[PDB]
C-alpha cells in the first residue's frame, strides 16, 4: 500500500552535497591525529585518580575540538543552513556539537572490541581512555550502547549524513529565533531521508528504519543531557581549562 516516490532532482542534489560535505570534513585515515597533544595512559584498572591526573584529557579535548571544527565546516554546507541568521547558526551548532561528534564517531567505532579504532594502538580509544579523561560510566556505557545500536542499523552513508544534518538543524533547541525556518529546512532533509529509505533500502533493514533513526536522535538528547552535567563537574577541577581548548570551553561552557 505504501507508495515509493522517486527522489526529486533537488533531493538527489541535497544527498550529493551532504556526501560531498562529509568527505570534505571527515578524514577516514585519521592522519591529523598525531598533531594533537599526545595520549597518555597510566595505571587505573579510580575517580579520585582520574580527576587528579586527567592523562587522556589533553588528547581527547584536542580530538573533540578538532571534531567541532569539522562539524562547523559540515553544517555550513547543509542546504539552507547559510540562510539562517548567524545567531541561530551558532545556537544550533553549540547545542548539537557533542551529539554530531557522537554520531560521526560511529565511522571509527568497531564492534570487534567495542572501541573507537582510529589506527595504531595509541589512537584506539577504549572505555578506560574516556574515564582517564574524567568522565563516568553514567555517560560512557549508554554511549557504547548507542554506538552499537547505530552500527546495527547498517546505515548507508547517505542516511548517515542526512541524520547528522537533521540533528544539527533542529527547531526544538533552546534559544532559537526563527524556529519556523529551521523546521522548514529540517523537513526538507527529513523528506529526503524518508524518500531515500523507501526506494533505496532493501529488506529487512528497510522496515521501520526511519523511526529507529528518529529514536537515535532522542538517545542523543539524553547523552547530551548527561554529558552537560559531567562537563560542568569536570570544569570544577582546577587547572582544567589548560587541558581543554578555547573552542571546547565556549561551545560547552
Ligand atoms: C575531552 C572530551 C572527551 C568527551 C568526548 C566524549 C565522551 C566521546 C564522544 C565520542 C567519543 C569518541 C569519538 C571518536 C572520534 C574519532 C573519529 O571517529 C572522529 C570523531 O569526530 C571522533 C570524535 C572517542 C573518545 C570519547 C568521545 C570523544 O568530551 C570532551 O570534551
UniProtKB/Swiss-Prot annotation:
It is found in: Nucleus; Cytoplasm. Residues 10-253 form the NR LBD domain. It comes from the Eukaryota. GO terms for biological process: apoptotic process involved in mammary gland involution; calcium ion transport; cell differentiation; cell morphogenesis; decidualization; intestinal absorption; intracellular calcium ion homeostasis; intracellular receptor signaling pathway. Residues 76-94 are annotated as: Interaction with coactivator LXXLL motif. Keywords: Cytoplasm, Disease variant, DNA-binding, Metal-binding, Nucleus, Receptor, Transcription, Transcription regulation, Ubl conjugation, Zinc, Zinc-finger. Calcitriol binds at residues 26, 67, 104, 108, 135, 227. Changing residue 190 to P: In VDDR2A; loss of calcitriol receptor activity; loss of affinity for calcitriol; decreased ligand-independent localization to the nucleus; loss of interaction with RXRA; loss of interaction with NCOR1; loss of interaction with NCOA1; loss of sequence-specific DNA-binding. GO terms for cellular component: chromatin; cytosol; nucleoplasm; nucleus; receptor complex; RNA polymerase II transcription regulator complex. Its main location: nucleus. Changing residue 104 to L: In VDDR2A; loss of calcitriol receptor activity; decreased affinity for calcitriol by a factor of 1000; no effect on interaction with RXRA; changed interaction with NCOR1; loss of interaction with NCOA1; no effect on sequence-specific DNA-binding. The keyword S-adenosyl-L-methionine does not apply. It is linked to Rickets vitamin D-dependent 2A: A disorder of vitamin D metabolism resulting in severe rickets, hypocalcemia and secondary hyperparathyroidism. Most patients have total alopecia in addition to rickets. Belongs to the nuclear hormone receptor family. NR1 subfamily. Nuclear receptor for calcitriol, the active form of vitamin D3 which mediates the action of this vitamin on cells. Enters the nucleus upon vitamin D3 binding where it forms heterodimers with the retinoid X receptor/RXR. The VDR-RXR heterodimers bind to specific response elements on DNA and activate the transcription of vitamin D3-responsive target genes. Plays a central role in calcium homeostasis. Also functions as a receptor for the secondary bile acid lithocholic acid (LCA) and its metabolites. Homodimer in the absence of bound vitamin D3. Heterodimer with RXRA after vitamin D3 binding. Interacts with MED1, NCOA1, NCOA2, NCOA3 and NCOA6 coactivators, leading to a strong increase of transcription of target genes. Interacts with the corepressor NCOR1. Interacts with SNW1. Interacts with IRX4, the interaction does not affect its transactivation activity. Interacts with CRY1. Interacts with CRY2 in a ligand-dependent manner. Composed of three domains: a modulating N-terminal domain, a DNA-binding domain and a C-terminal ligand-binding domain. This is Vitamin D3 receptor. The chain holds residues 118 to 423 of 427 of the full protein.
